Structure 1
């Protein structure tokens, strides 16, 4: 509880300030996938009969 929280060193600002900052902080967007956007993953395909029945 609150006694805990004030008494706990390894807490508060000074302690953080003195730690190194990770590199994933200064990362970048990620992106993951995009030049696959037009490439269908479904592996299924339709078929000229089904399409011709539909449309």
Structure 2
């Protein structure tokens, strides 16, 4: 604590003087919706497989 309390900088008004990173007002950005139907595995199947089991 004696470290902490003594520390300048890390006090409050200092945080208040700094302007707030643009990443605070940011959007979540949603990161890949429009690829959702397309299968990214690239394997797919074969009518011989789709047939035996079903």
TM alignment of 1:4-43, pairs within 5 A: 4-43=3-42
Alpha-carbon separation, structure 2, partners of 1:11 and 1:22: 17
Q: CA deviation at 1:16?
A: 0.5
The number of aligned residues is 54
Q: CA deviation at 1:41?
A: 0.5
SS of aligned partner of 1:24: helix
Unmatched 5+ residue regions in structure 1?
A: none
Alpha-carbon separation, structure 2, partners of 1:45 and 1:16: 54
Q: CA deviation at 1:30?
A: 1.6
TM-score normalised over the length of structure 2: 0.94
* Higher relative helix content: 2
